[PDB]
Structures are given as structure tokens and as C-alpha cells.
């Protein structure tokens, strides 16, 4: 499942990750066709919508 996302906006939305699965996530590695260099980040905050 690919995603439509931009590095400039830190907000991200995930489809199939339930609240229980959400707890415990720290690190996210993402690679976008926009920029050749891949990126890594900390998941500072988790919110339920």
C-alpha cells in the first residue's frame, strides 16, 4: 500500500494500523519518489481520529 505524503508536512495518516497496534511505534523509515534520499524519523505523537 503506497502513500501520498510530503516531507514538509510531518503529519501522516495510516490505513490499517489500529489503536492497539499503534501503541509502541517509535521509528518510521520512509522513501518518497519526490526525493531520492530516503528518510527516517521519530513518531513523536500518536492520535486517534
Amino acid at each position: 500500500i503506497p502513500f501520498n505524503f510530503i516531507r514538509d508536512r510531518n503529519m501522516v495518516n495510516l490505513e490499517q494500523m489500529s489503536w492497539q497496534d499503534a501503541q509502541g511505534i517509535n521509528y518510521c523509515t520512509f522513501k518518497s519518489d519526490f526525493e531520492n534520499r530516503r528518510y527516517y524519523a521519530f513518531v513523536n505523537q500518536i492520535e486517534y481520529v
Partner: peptide
């Protein structure tokens, strides 16, 4: 109402969404 960024094909005419 809110939509995830996961290329969810949405059809305005008939699409019905279960979640808020």
C-alpha cells in the same frame, strides 16, 4: 469525513463510508 492518505479510490456518486 476524514480520509487517509492511502490512495483510497473514492466515487462521489455512490461511495458510502462507515467510519466518521
Amino acid at each position: 469525513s476524514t480520509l487517509p492518505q492511502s490512495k483510497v479510490n473514492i466515487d462521489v456518486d455512490n461511495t458510502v463510508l462507515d467510519y466518521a
